[PDB]
Design a protein around this ligand. Structure first.
Ligand code: HEM
Ligand SMILES: O=N[O-]
Length: 152
């Protein structure tokens, strides 16, 4: 788990995301899709996006970015007490969307990259430690649900 201090850092960092949820969301998905094109194939509604320019110009991608980070933000604000929030996401992502846990690793890494990219010099070593711990906890709890379902 995370310490109280670590949770406070996580939620302080998240303040940055909340000032521009769509912009952060868009950049996270673009980072995911460009670094790992196989992930784009999981989205029927985005696999028409051939180029990063098309991704950047896609208002629906920005919209989905907002949905994703809003969901994650709600989870983070539970400070690990997130069973009710996490269970349905784990189940939809395993059973409906067929998203291997590796792709959740990819998007976790994308979040860290985007935070540094948008806030260079303002995402300190302690902050990166705390956010990484929160993202791992999220991933690990999803993985438990994936194992239950025998997914991958
Ligand atoms: C931070 C981690 C993630 C969060 C919080 C998240 C959140 C969400 C939410 C709230 C939805 C809509 C409700 C639902 O279907 O459950 C959704 C849909 C979806 N997610 Fe995720 N997601 C994450 C990671 C991923 C990753 C890495 C992929 C890889 C491709 C993915 C693929 C999809 C797909 C294909 C849909 C359905 C889109 C549609 O039908 O239009 N998700 N996600
Ligand atoms: O973008 N993940 O839903």
């Amino acid at each position: 788990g995370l310490s109280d201090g670590e949770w406070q850092q996580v939620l302080n960092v998240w303040g940055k995301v909340e000032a521009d949820i769509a912009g952060h969301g868009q950049e996270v998905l673009i980072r995911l899709f460009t670094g790992h094109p196989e992930t784009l194939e999981k989205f029927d509604k985005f696999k028409h996006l051939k180029t990063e320019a098309e991704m950047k110009a896609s208002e629906d991608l920005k919209k989905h970015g907002t949905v994703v980070l809003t969901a994650l933000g709600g989870i983070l604000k539970k400070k690990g007490h997130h069973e009710a929030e996490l269970k349905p996401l784990a189940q939809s992502h395993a059973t409906k969307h067929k998203i291997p846990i590796k792709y959740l690793e990819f998007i976790s890494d994308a979040i860290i990259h985007v935070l540094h990219s948008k806030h260079p010099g303002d995402f300190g070593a302690d902050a990166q430690g705390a956010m990484t711990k929160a993202l791992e906890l999220f991933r690990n709890d999803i993985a438990a649900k994936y194992k239950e379902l025998g997914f991958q």
